[PDB]
C-alpha cells in the first residue's frame, strides 16, 4: 500500500521479491488467485475496479469497471465474488467477463471487510517437500517452487 | 424567453413535434400529457385517463408513423403508444418494467430505447413491442438512469446516482465511456443535431383547424383538429366552437380544477386547471371577462382567465392588504373580501385602474359586528350582503348575519348550532342561504329573512364547500374526500362526482350570470361616486371612499 | 358474574394507533380499557398481532430517524412482560407486517429494505431465524397466517399490487387477487369460514375472498369508508379502523348488508391497525387445527417446523446449516460456501443465491475484523480482529 | 404517576367512598382512582363511544357521593358530541345531557350539594349560569365577565 502501489510476488521463502504489477494501482486490496486458470485478480477501492492479470503480470484486463468502494474479493467456480463498502452487500460476477453482476445479499447492517471461499472440498493439494525431515531444514521450512525452501527465526541472526 | 406565461409545473419531459410545429409535454402535477403549439397558443390535455406518473416522452412525426410514446412508473407501470392526436392508445410494453424513467426513439431503425431505474437495465423494442433486446443489463454502470440519448451508434444516458453521464454502444453497450464526471443533477439529456430530427411532409401546414392541428396515425388526412379546454368541436371537424355550459370550480390545496357538472364526464378539463397555488381556500369568477379569482398565502389575491392566460397578482397586501375569502359583485365591479388579520369585511373596486379598498364591517364590540368571518356571499341586485361568522369569545356569537352592501343595517339572521361554521352560499333564484355546519356535520338551509331553517343534508364529516346551481346542491367533504351532488330541495338523490380527492376545499359553480337582472344603483349610476360605489336595497347606490379618506 | 370478583379480560380488540396501543371491549356499553395501554417515547406501532394462548401482544415499531426504535416487541395485556423479540437485521423501511402462528409458535414478519423485502420467520423463545423469501419486484407488506389451512397470506401495495397466498414456508405462491386492488392497506383472515378479508383505502373498498380464490365480494364501499387502514374479523362482524373518520367501526361481515356500521370509539387520531384478542379466533385443540403436525414439540424439528398442506409429516427447515438425513436435525453444510467478515461478526453465505440459510450461524466477534481464512483440517476460521486502531490481533 | 395511573387533567374527589375522579386529556374520557388501600386501581368510566351521550372533551367534573351522581362539563367535539353539561351515575351508567346550547368555551362546573344546583362559567358568553341537577331552571347569575375560570360555591356566596 506504499506509494506507487506494487503487487509484490515472491516464493514462500521470499527468494525473488518481484512486483508483478506496479502501475495503475493506488490501494490494492482483496488479492485473489485463479488456481484453475493461473490468473491474478484484485480490486482497488480508490480505482473502484476489479482487474485480472497473469501470474507474471503481462496481461491486465479490467473485469469490472463500475463499483463503489469494492474492498474484498474472492473467486470460485466461474464466478467472482466481492464486497462493497458503500452499498454494504456482497455481489457476484462472471470471472471471465463480469456479465452477471448481481447482488448476493441484502444491505448488510455494517460494512463487509473481507470475503473468502471455504473450500470444504479438495483444495490446492500438492505434496509438501517440508514433510521429509522438515524438508532438510534444521529450522522452519517453507515449501516454495522446485523443492522446499528453509526458513530461519527472525528474532535471531541466522 | 419563457414559452408559457402561466406556471405549468412539474413538466418532467418535453417532446417537440418539429413536423407539426407543436410541443408535447407531461405534467406530473396534473398527471396528464398536454400538447400545444410551439409558441403556446392552445394548450390541451391529450391523454388523461389511466395515467398516474407519466415520465418520459417520445415522438415520431414522420409521415408514415405519426406516433407518440410515454412511460408511466406508477401503479402497474408500463409504456404506452398512441397516435399523436391522442387516439389508438395501446400498451406496447408492460412486462419486466418497474420504473421506466427514460425513453427515446431511433427514427431510422424504428426502435425505441427505454431504461428502468429500479431493475437497472437499458432495453429497446420495436414500435409494437414484439421484438425486445437488452443493451445493458445486470451491470453496476446503470444504477439510477434518468434520461437517454442516441447519436449514431452511441447511447448516452444520465445516471442521477453516479452523477456522471456515460456513453456506450447502442447494440451491446461495450464501449463504455464517461462523457462527464461530476454533474449535480444530470436529469434530461438531448443530442442537438439535425440528423436526430428527420424532416417530413407536414399535413397540418394546409389544415383548416381553427385552434390546433395534430398529426394522426389514422388516415386519409393523417391529421385532426383539437379543441382547447372548455371548447367543443363542430361536426365539420375543422372548426371548434366555445362551450358555454357551467361547471364546478373545485378548489383543492395546491391545485384548482374545472369539473363538468355532468357526473358522467370524469375528465377534469372543463377549464385550464390552475396549478402551483398554496393553501387555496375559496374562489370567485368574473363571468364577463372569463376570469378566475383565488386567494393564496400570504393573504394575496391572484386572477387568471379560464384558458390559463394573464395569470397575475391582481392585488397585493402591499397596496390592498390581506384577504382570505372572496365574494365578487359582478354588477357593480366590486370584490368583497374578508380580512383575517383585522377580522373585518372589506370591498375592493375592480372597475378602473386604481385599486380602492375600504373596511365595511369591523368588530365594534357589539353582537352585530364581525368576530371571525369565514364565508361571505353577495346579492348585487337586492343590495344585500350575507356572511357567516364563527364568532369570538369576546361576545360575538357564531352566526349567519346579513347587511346592506354598504356596510349598514346589520342583523343576525340565524344563530345557535353553528359550531365550526363553514362557508355560506346564496341561491339568488330562491333567496335561500345554504351553509355547512361541521360541528353538527350537516348542510342547513334558510331564507334570507332569517326564517325557515331546515337541515338539508345529514351525516357529513367535514363539509367544506357549498355551491347551488339549478336544482342541485354541490358540496365537498374533506374527510370523506368526495364531491357530492344532491337536490337542493330535499338533498335526497346523492351522486358522487369525484372520490378519493385529497385536500378538498370550497367550490363554486361557474354559471353564466343572469343578464336580465344585471342592473343596480351603481350600474345605472356609474362614475357618480369619486372612488367607491356600493349598491343598497331598492336600487339606490351609496357612495363610499377608500381607506384613509372620508366621504364629503 | 358474582359482581364482586375480578378477572382479566379474555375477549377484546387491540387497536394500534401510532402513538399508543390500546384495547377496547366489544360490548359497546362497556367503556373500560381492556388492557394497560402501551405508550412511551418512540412508539410507532405499524401493526399488531396477538398470541392468545401465551397472552402476548406483538407489534412492529418503525422509525426512519432512529434505527434503534425499529423493533418487534411484545407485552402481556397487564403491561408486565416487555421484551424486544427482534432488533437486528431490520431493514431501512422497517418491519411492515407481523403474523403470529400460535399453533407452531412461529413469528412471520416482512422485513423491508430500500429495494427489497424479506418474508422472515422467527421461532418464538429461541434464536432460530430464517429468511423464507427474498423478493425485489414484489413488495409484500402486511402478512397474516392461517395455521388451520396451512396458508400464509400477505398484501402487496407496490407496483402491480396483489394479495398472495403461499404455504407456511412461502413456496407455492398464488395470486388470490390481482385486479381491482390498488393499496391493500390491511389484511385479515376469518378463521371460521376460511375467508380472507381486506381493506383498500385507495379504492375505498372492503372486500373478502375465500382462501382458494373463487368468490370475491365487496362487503362495504362507496364515498364513505374513505381510508380503512386495518381490519379484523370476529364472529359475524368485521372491525376496521378508519384513519380519516377517526372511528373504529363494526359491521356484519356478510356482504349485501346495508345496516349502518356500529362505532366502537370516536375521535381517535392516527389509527393504524386492529386485531381481536380472543381464544376463539386462535384454537389450539388438535381437532381444531386439522391435526397440525407442528402442534407438539415443534414437530420434533430442531430449528423450524412448517406444516404443509396434505403432508402430514412436519417438514423441517434449518435457520443455519443443512437438514440431515434424519429430517429433524441440522448440521453444518458440507458444500463449499463463502465466508465474509462484517465489522462485529463473521458470517457465511451459500454460493447458490436461492438458498438463504447461512452455512453456519453468525459468530459475533470484536470491534473490527478485516480478513478471513478457514482451515478445514482444524475447522477454524482465522481472522485479524483489529480490536482498536492500534491494537491488532490474529 | 402516569407510569402507573396514567395521565389526568382535572380532579373531583369522592370523600365518602375514597375514590378520586379524574379527566383524561389524551384519551378524552372520565376515570376514577381508588385512594383507599395501598394499590392504585384506575378504570375508565365514560369514553367517547361516538354517540351524543359520551365524553367529547371534558373540562370540569364534579361529584355528589351521597346521591351517587356525577356531573361534568364537556366542550364537545366536531365529531358530533355537543358542548354540554352532562350527568351520570358514579359508576359510569345512565348518562344524560342536562343542559346544552350557549356553552361556548365552557369552563369548569361546580355543584352546590345543599341546593342541588349546578354552577358553570361560559367564557364565550362571559357569564356564570346556574341550573338544577335535573336539567331544569337554567338562569344567568353573573353578567359581563371576560374569561371566568374557577367557580366555588360556599354557604350563600359564589
Ligand atoms: C415463551 O415464553 C413465555 C414466558 O414463559 C411464555 O409465556 C407463558 O405462556 C404460558 C402458556 O400460554 C402461560 O401459561 C398460562 O398461564 C395462564 C395464567 O397466566 C394460565 O391461565 C394458562 O392456563 C397457562 O398456564 C404463561 O403464564 C406465560 N407466561 C408469561 C410470562 O407470559 C410463552 O408461552 C412462550 N412461548 C413459546 C413460543 O414457547
Ligand atoms: C516449531 O514450534 C514447535 C512447537 O514449539 C517445535 O516443536 C518445533 O520444533 C518448531 N520448529 C519447527 C521446525 O517446526
Ligand atoms: C382504464 O382502465 C379501465 C379498467 O381496466 C378500462 O375499463 C378503461 O377502458 C381504461 N381506459 C383507458 C383510457 O385505458
Ligand atoms: C467496442 O466494443 C467492441 C465489441 O466488444 C470491441 O470489439 C471494440 O474494441 C470496443 N472498442 C472500444 C473503443 O472499447
Ligand atoms: C401448488 O399450487 C398449484 C396451483 O398453482 C396447485 O395445483 C398445487 O396442487 C399446489 N401444491 C400441491 C398441494 O400440490
Coordinates of N, CA and C in Angstrom, one line a residue, chain C residues 50-231:
Chain C
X50 N -51.6 -10.9 18.1 CA -51.8 -11.3 19.4 C -51.6 -12.9 19.5
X51 N -51.0 -13.3 20.5 CA -50.9 -14.8 20.8 C -51.7 -15.0 22.1
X52 N -52.9 -15.5 21.9 CA -53.9 -15.6 23.0 C -53.4 -16.6 24.0
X53 N -52.9 -17.7 23.5 CA -52.6 -18.8 24.4 C -51.5 -18.4 25.4
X54 N -50.4 -17.8 24.9 CA -49.4 -17.3 25.7 C -49.7 -15.9 26.3
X55 N -50.8 -15.3 25.9 CA -51.1 -14.0 26.4 C -50.1 -12.9 26.1
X56 N -49.8 -12.7 24.9 CA -48.8 -11.7 24.5 C -49.4 -10.9 23.3
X57 N -48.9 -9.6 23.2 CA -49.4 -8.7 22.2 C -48.2 -8.2 21.4
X58 N -48.0 -8.6 20.2 CA -46.8 -8.3 19.4 C -47.1 -7.0 18.6
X59 N -46.1 -6.2 18.3 CA -46.2 -5.1 17.4 C -44.9 -4.7 16.8
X60 N -44.9 -4.1 15.7 CA -43.7 -3.7 15.0 C -43.6 -2.2 15.0
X61 N -42.5 -1.7 15.6 CA -42.2 -0.3 15.7 C -41.3 0.1 14.5
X62 N -41.5 1.2 14.0 CA -40.8 1.7 12.8 C -40.4 3.2 13.1
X63 N -39.2 3.6 12.8 CA -38.7 5.0 12.9 C -37.6 5.2 11.9
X64 N -37.9 6.1 10.9 CA -36.8 6.4 10.0 C -35.7 7.1 10.6
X65 N -36.0 8.0 11.6 CA -34.9 8.9 12.1 C -34.0 8.0 13.0
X66 N -34.5 7.2 13.9 CA -33.8 6.4 14.8 C -33.8 5.0 14.5
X67 N -32.6 4.3 14.3 CA -32.6 2.9 13.9 C -32.9 2.0 15.1
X68 N -32.6 2.5 16.3 CA -32.8 1.6 17.5 C -34.3 1.5 17.8
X69 N -35.1 2.4 17.3 CA -36.5 2.3 17.6 C -37.2 1.2 16.8
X70 N -36.7 0.8 15.6 CA -37.2 -0.2 14.8 C -37.0 -1.5 15.4
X71 N -38.1 -2.1 15.9 CA -38.0 -3.4 16.6 C -39.4 -4.1 16.5
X72 N -39.4 -5.4 16.8 CA -40.6 -6.2 17.0 C -40.6 -6.5 18.5
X73 N -41.6 -6.0 19.2 CA -41.7 -6.2 20.7 C -43.0 -7.0 21.0
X74 N -43.1 -7.3 22.3 CA -44.3 -8.0 22.8 C -44.5 -7.6 24.2
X75 N -45.7 -7.7 24.7 CA -46.1 -7.4 26.1 C -47.4 -8.1 26.4
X76 N -47.5 -8.5 27.7 CA -48.7 -9.1 28.1 C -49.8 -8.0 28.3
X77 N -51.1 -8.4 28.3 CA -52.1 -7.4 28.4 C -52.0 -6.6 29.7
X78 N -51.6 -7.1 30.8 CA -51.4 -6.4 32.0 C -50.2 -5.4 32.0
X79 N -49.5 -5.3 30.9 CA -48.4 -4.5 30.8 C -47.2 -4.8 31.7
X80 N -46.9 -6.1 31.8 CA -45.9 -6.6 32.7 C -44.6 -7.0 32.0
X81 N -44.7 -7.9 31.1 CA -43.5 -8.5 30.5 C -43.3 -7.9 29.1
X82 N -42.3 -7.0 29.0 CA -42.0 -6.4 27.7 C -40.6 -6.8 27.4
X83 N -40.4 -7.4 26.2 CA -39.1 -7.8 25.7 C -39.0 -7.7 24.2
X84 N -37.9 -7.2 23.7 CA -37.7 -7.0 22.3 C -37.4 -8.3 21.6
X85 N -38.4 -8.8 20.8 CA -38.2 -10.1 20.1 C -37.2 -9.9 19.0
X86 N -37.3 -8.9 18.2 CA -36.4 -8.8 17.0 C -35.9 -7.3 17.0
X87 N -34.6 -7.2 17.0 CA -34.0 -5.9 16.9 C -32.8 -5.8 15.9
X88 N -32.3 -6.9 15.4 CA -31.2 -6.8 14.5 C -31.6 -7.4 13.1
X89 N -31.1 -6.8 12.0 CA -31.4 -7.2 10.7 C -32.6 -6.5 10.1
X90 N -33.2 -5.6 10.9 CA -34.4 -4.8 10.4 C -33.9 -3.9 9.3
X91 N -34.6 -3.9 8.2 CA -34.3 -3.1 7.0 C -34.5 -1.6 7.2
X92 N -34.2 -0.9 6.2 CA -34.3 0.6 6.2 C -35.8 1.0 6.4
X93 N -36.7 0.3 5.7 CA -38.1 0.6 5.8 C -38.8 0.0 7.0
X94 N -38.1 -0.8 7.8 CA -38.6 -1.4 9.0 C -39.5 -2.6 8.8
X95 N -39.9 -3.2 9.9 CA -40.9 -4.3 9.8 C -42.2 -3.7 9.4
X96 N -42.9 -4.3 8.4 CA -44.1 -3.8 7.8 C -45.3 -4.7 8.0
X97 N -45.1 -5.8 8.7 CA -46.2 -6.7 9.0 C -45.8 -7.8 9.9
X98 N -46.7 -8.3 10.8 CA -46.5 -9.3 11.8 C -47.6 -10.3 11.7
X99 N -47.3 -11.6 11.6 CA -48.3 -12.7 11.7 C -47.7 -13.7 12.7
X100 N -48.5 -14.1 13.6 CA -48.1 -15.0 14.7 C -48.9 -16.3 14.5
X101 N -48.1 -17.3 14.3 CA -48.6 -18.7 14.2 C -48.7 -19.3 15.6
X102 N -49.8 -19.1 16.2 CA -50.0 -19.6 17.6 C -49.8 -21.1 17.7
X103 N -50.2 -21.8 16.6 CA -50.1 -23.3 16.7 C -48.6 -23.8 16.8
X104 N -47.8 -23.2 15.9 CA -46.4 -23.6 15.9 C -45.4 -22.7 16.6
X105 N -46.0 -21.6 17.1 CA -45.1 -20.6 17.8 C -44.1 -20.0 16.9
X106 N -44.4 -19.7 15.6 CA -43.6 -19.1 14.7 C -44.1 -17.7 14.4
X107 N -43.2 -16.7 14.4 CA -43.5 -15.3 14.1 C -43.0 -14.9 12.7
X108 N -44.0 -14.7 11.8 CA -43.7 -14.3 10.4 C -43.7 -12.7 10.4
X109 N -42.7 -12.2 9.8 CA -42.7 -10.7 9.6 C -42.0 -10.4 8.3
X110 N -42.4 -9.3 7.7 CA -41.9 -8.8 6.4 C -40.9 -7.7 6.6
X111 N -39.6 -8.1 6.7 CA -38.5 -7.1 6.7 C -38.5 -6.4 5.4
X112 N -38.4 -5.0 5.5 CA -38.4 -4.2 4.3 C -37.2 -3.4 4.2
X113 N -36.5 -3.4 3.0 CA -35.3 -2.7 2.8 C -35.6 -1.6 1.7
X114 N -34.6 -0.9 1.3 CA -34.8 0.2 0.3 C -35.3 -0.4 -1.0
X115 N -34.8 -1.5 -1.4 CA -35.1 -2.0 -2.8 C -35.5 -3.5 -2.7
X116 N -35.7 -4.1 -1.5 CA -36.0 -5.5 -1.5 C -36.7 -5.8 -0.1
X117 N -37.5 -6.9 -0.1 CA -38.3 -7.2 1.0 C -38.0 -8.7 1.4
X118 N -37.9 -9.0 2.7 CA -37.7 -10.3 3.2 C -38.9 -10.8 4.0
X119 N -39.4 -11.9 3.7 CA -40.5 -12.5 4.5 C -39.9 -13.5 5.4
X120 N -39.5 -13.0 6.6 CA -38.7 -13.8 7.5 C -39.6 -14.5 8.5
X121 N -39.1 -15.6 9.1 CA -39.8 -16.3 10.2 C -38.9 -16.5 11.4
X122 N -39.5 -16.3 12.6 CA -38.7 -16.5 13.8 C -39.5 -17.4 14.7
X123 N -38.8 -18.4 15.2 CA -39.4 -19.3 16.2 C -39.3 -18.6 17.6
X124 N -40.5 -18.4 18.2 CA -40.5 -17.6 19.4 C -39.8 -18.3 20.5
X125 N -39.2 -17.5 21.4 CA -38.5 -18.1 22.6 C -37.2 -18.8 22.2
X126 N -36.7 -18.6 21.0 CA -35.5 -19.2 20.5 C -34.7 -18.1 19.8
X127 N -33.6 -18.6 19.1 CA -32.8 -17.7 18.3 C -32.8 -18.1 16.8
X128 N -33.5 -19.2 16.4 CA -33.6 -19.5 15.0 C -34.4 -18.5 14.3
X129 N -33.9 -18.0 13.1 CA -34.5 -17.0 12.3 C -34.1 -17.2 10.9
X130 N -35.0 -17.4 10.0 CA -34.8 -17.8 8.6 C -35.5 -16.9 7.7
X131 N -34.8 -16.5 6.6 CA -35.4 -15.7 5.6 C -36.1 -16.6 4.6
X132 N -37.4 -16.7 4.7 CA -38.2 -17.7 3.8 C -38.1 -17.2 2.4
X133 N -38.3 -15.9 2.2 CA -38.4 -15.3 0.8 C -37.6 -14.0 0.7
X134 N -37.0 -13.8 -0.4 CA -36.3 -12.6 -0.8 C -36.7 -12.2 -2.1
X135 N -37.5 -11.1 -2.2 CA -38.1 -10.6 -3.4 C -37.7 -9.1 -3.7
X136 N -37.7 -8.8 -4.9 CA -37.3 -7.4 -5.3 C -38.5 -6.7 -6.1
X137 N -39.0 -7.4 -7.1 CA -40.1 -6.8 -7.9 C -41.4 -6.7 -7.0
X138 N -41.7 -7.6 -6.2 CA -42.9 -7.6 -5.4 C -42.6 -6.9 -4.0
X139 N -43.6 -6.4 -3.4 CA -43.5 -5.7 -2.2 C -44.5 -6.2 -1.1
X140 N -44.3 -7.4 -0.6 CA -45.2 -7.9 0.5 C -45.0 -7.0 1.7
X141 N -46.1 -6.4 2.2 CA -46.0 -5.5 3.3 C -46.8 -6.1 4.5
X142 N -48.1 -6.3 4.4 CA -48.8 -6.9 5.6 C -49.1 -8.3 5.4
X143 N -48.9 -9.1 6.4 CA -48.9 -10.6 6.4 C -49.8 -11.1 7.4
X144 N -50.5 -12.2 7.1 CA -51.4 -12.8 8.0 C -51.3 -14.3 7.8
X145 N -51.3 -15.1 8.9 CA -51.1 -16.6 8.9 C -52.3 -17.3 9.2
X146 N -52.6 -18.4 8.6 CA -53.7 -19.3 8.8 C -53.2 -20.7 9.0
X147 N -52.8 -21.0 10.2 CA -52.2 -22.3 10.5 C -53.2 -23.5 10.3
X148 N -54.5 -23.2 10.5 CA -55.5 -24.3 10.3 C -55.5 -24.8 8.9
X149 N -55.5 -23.9 7.9 CA -55.4 -24.2 6.5 C -54.0 -24.3 6.0
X150 N -53.0 -24.1 6.8 CA -51.6 -24.1 6.4 C -51.3 -23.2 5.3
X151 N -51.8 -22.0 5.4 CA -51.6 -21.0 4.3 C -51.0 -19.7 5.0
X152 N -50.4 -18.9 4.1 CA -49.8 -17.6 4.5 C -50.1 -16.6 3.5
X153 N -51.0 -15.6 3.9 CA -51.5 -14.6 3.0 C -50.8 -13.3 3.4
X154 N -50.4 -12.6 2.4 CA -49.9 -11.2 2.5 C -50.4 -10.3 1.5
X155 N -50.3 -9.0 1.7 CA -50.8 -8.0 0.8 C -49.6 -7.2 0.3
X156 N -49.7 -6.8 -1.0 CA -48.7 -6.0 -1.7 C -49.4 -4.8 -2.3
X157 N -48.8 -3.6 -1.9 CA -49.4 -2.3 -2.4 C -48.3 -1.6 -3.2
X158 N -47.3 -2.3 -3.7 CA -46.3 -1.7 -4.6 C -46.8 -1.7 -6.0
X159 N -45.8 -1.6 -6.9 CA -46.2 -1.8 -8.4 C -46.8 -3.2 -8.6
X160 N -47.8 -3.2 -9.3 CA -48.6 -4.5 -9.5 C -49.1 -5.0 -8.2
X161 N -50.0 -4.3 -7.5 CA -50.5 -4.7 -6.2 C -51.3 -6.0 -6.3
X162 N -51.2 -6.8 -5.2 CA -51.9 -8.1 -5.2 C -52.0 -8.6 -3.8
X163 N -52.7 -9.7 -3.6 CA -52.8 -10.4 -2.4 C -52.4 -11.9 -2.7
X164 N -51.3 -12.3 -2.1 CA -50.7 -13.6 -2.4 C -50.9 -14.6 -1.3
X165 N -51.2 -15.9 -1.7 CA -51.3 -17.0 -0.7 C -50.1 -17.9 -1.0
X166 N -49.5 -18.4 0.1 CA -48.4 -19.3 0.0 C -48.4 -20.3 1.2
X167 N -47.7 -21.4 1.0 CA -47.6 -22.3 2.1 C -46.8 -21.6 3.3
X168 N -46.8 -22.3 4.4 CA -46.2 -21.8 5.6 C -44.7 -21.5 5.5
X169 N -44.0 -22.1 4.4 CA -42.6 -21.8 4.1 C -42.5 -20.9 2.9
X170 N -43.6 -20.4 2.4 CA -43.5 -19.5 1.2 C -43.0 -20.2 0.0
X171 N -43.7 -21.2 -0.5 CA -43.2 -22.0 -1.6 C -44.3 -21.9 -2.8
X172 N -45.5 -22.3 -2.5 CA -46.5 -22.3 -3.6 C -47.2 -21.0 -3.6
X173 N -46.6 -20.0 -4.2 CA -47.2 -18.7 -4.2 C -48.2 -18.6 -5.3
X174 N -49.4 -18.2 -4.9 CA -50.5 -17.9 -5.9 C -51.1 -16.6 -5.6
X175 N -51.6 -15.9 -6.6 CA -52.1 -14.6 -6.5 C -53.6 -14.7 -6.4
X176 N -54.1 -14.5 -5.1 CA -55.6 -14.6 -4.9 C -56.3 -13.5 -5.6
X177 N -55.9 -12.2 -5.4 CA -56.5 -11.1 -6.1 C -55.4 -10.3 -6.8
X178 N -55.6 -10.0 -8.1 CA -54.7 -9.3 -8.9 C -55.4 -8.1 -9.6
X179 N -56.7 -8.0 -9.6 CA -57.4 -6.9 -10.3 C -58.4 -6.3 -9.3
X180 N -58.6 -5.0 -9.5 CA -59.5 -4.3 -8.7 C -58.9 -4.0 -7.3
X181 N -57.6 -4.0 -7.2 CA -56.9 -3.8 -5.9 C -55.7 -2.9 -6.2
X182 N -55.6 -1.8 -5.4 CA -54.6 -0.8 -5.6 C -53.7 -0.7 -4.3
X183 N -54.2 -0.4 -3.2 CA -53.5 -0.3 -1.9 C -54.1 -1.1 -0.8
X184 N -53.9 -2.4 -0.8 CA -54.5 -3.3 0.2 C -53.8 -3.0 1.5
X185 N -54.1 -1.9 2.1 CA -53.5 -1.5 3.4 C -54.3 -2.2 4.5
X186 N -53.9 -3.4 4.9 CA -54.5 -4.1 5.9 C -55.2 -5.4 5.4
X187 N -55.0 -6.5 6.2 CA -55.4 -7.8 5.7 C -55.8 -8.6 7.0
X188 N -56.9 -9.4 6.8 CA -57.4 -10.2 7.9 C -57.9 -11.5 7.4
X189 N -57.9 -12.5 8.2 CA -58.4 -13.9 7.9 C -59.5 -14.3 8.8
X190 N -60.7 -14.7 8.2 CA -61.8 -15.3 9.0 C -61.5 -16.7 9.3
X191 N -61.1 -17.1 10.5 CA -60.7 -18.4 10.8 C -61.8 -19.4 10.6
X192 N -63.0 -19.0 11.0 CA -64.2 -20.0 11.0 C -64.5 -20.4 9.5
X193 N -64.8 -19.4 8.7 CA -65.3 -19.6 7.4 C -64.3 -19.7 6.2
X194 N -63.0 -19.6 6.6 CA -62.0 -19.7 5.6 C -62.1 -18.6 4.5
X195 N -62.3 -17.3 5.0 CA -62.3 -16.2 4.1 C -61.1 -15.2 4.4
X196 N -60.7 -14.5 3.4 CA -59.6 -13.6 3.6 C -60.1 -12.2 3.3
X197 N -60.4 -11.4 4.4 CA -60.9 -10.1 4.2 C -59.8 -9.1 4.1
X198 N -60.0 -8.0 3.3 CA -59.0 -7.0 3.2 C -59.7 -5.6 3.0
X199 N -58.9 -4.6 3.2 CA -59.4 -3.2 3.1 C -58.4 -2.5 2.2
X200 N -59.0 -1.7 1.2 CA -58.2 -0.9 0.3 C -58.6 0.5 0.4
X201 N -57.7 1.3 1.0 CA -58.0 2.7 1.2 C -57.9 3.5 -0.1
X202 N -57.2 3.0 -1.1 CA -57.1 3.7 -2.4 C -58.4 3.6 -3.2
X203 N -59.1 2.4 -3.2 CA -60.4 2.3 -3.8 C -61.6 2.4 -2.9
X204 N -61.3 2.7 -1.6 CA -62.4 2.8 -0.6 C -63.3 1.6 -0.7
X205 N -62.7 0.4 -0.6 CA -63.4 -0.8 -0.7 C -63.0 -1.8 0.4
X206 N -64.0 -2.5 1.0 CA -63.8 -3.5 2.0 C -64.3 -4.8 1.3
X207 N -63.5 -5.8 1.1 CA -63.9 -7.0 0.3 C -63.3 -8.2 1.0
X208 N -63.9 -9.3 0.6 CA -63.5 -10.6 1.1 C -63.3 -11.6 -0.1
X209 N -62.5 -12.6 0.1 CA -62.3 -13.7 -0.9 C -62.0 -15.0 -0.1
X210 N -62.6 -16.1 -0.6 CA -62.3 -17.4 0.1 C -60.8 -17.7 -0.2
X211 N -60.3 -18.6 0.7 CA -58.8 -18.9 0.7 C -58.4 -19.5 -0.7
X212 N -59.3 -20.3 -1.3 CA -59.0 -20.9 -2.6 C -59.5 -20.0 -3.7
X213 N -59.2 -18.7 -3.8 CA -59.7 -17.9 -4.8 C -61.2 -17.8 -4.8
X214 N -61.8 -18.2 -5.9 CA -63.3 -18.4 -6.0 C -64.0 -17.1 -5.7
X215 N -64.9 -17.1 -4.8 CA -65.8 -15.9 -4.6 C -65.0 -14.7 -4.1
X216 N -65.3 -13.6 -4.8 CA -64.7 -12.3 -4.4 C -65.8 -11.3 -4.4
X217 N -66.2 -10.8 -3.2 CA -67.4 -10.0 -3.0 C -67.0 -8.8 -2.1
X218 N -67.7 -7.7 -2.4 CA -67.4 -6.4 -1.7 C -68.3 -6.3 -0.5
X219 N -67.8 -6.2 0.7 CA -68.6 -6.0 1.9 C -69.1 -4.6 2.0
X220 N -68.2 -3.6 1.9 CA -68.6 -2.2 2.0 C -67.8 -1.4 1.0
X221 N -68.3 -0.3 0.5 CA -67.7 0.5 -0.4 C -68.4 1.8 -0.5
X222 N -67.9 2.7 -1.4 CA -68.6 3.9 -1.7 C -67.9 5.2 -1.3
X223 N -68.6 6.3 -1.3 CA -68.0 7.5 -0.8 C -67.5 7.5 0.6
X224 N -68.4 6.8 1.5 CA -68.0 6.6 2.8 C -66.8 5.6 2.8
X225 N -66.3 5.3 4.0 CA -65.1 4.5 4.2 C -64.0 5.0 3.4
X226 N -63.6 6.3 3.6 CA -62.5 6.9 2.8 C -61.2 6.3 2.9
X227 N -60.8 5.8 4.1 CA -59.5 5.3 4.4 C -59.6 4.2 5.5
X228 N -60.0 3.0 5.2 CA -59.8 1.9 6.1 C -58.4 1.4 6.1
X229 N -57.8 1.4 7.3 CA -56.4 1.1 7.4 C -56.1 -0.2 8.0
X230 N -57.0 -0.9 8.6 CA -56.8 -2.2 9.3 C -58.1 -2.9 9.6
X231 N -58.2 -4.1 9.3 CA -59.4 -4.9 9.5 C -59.1 -6.2 10.3

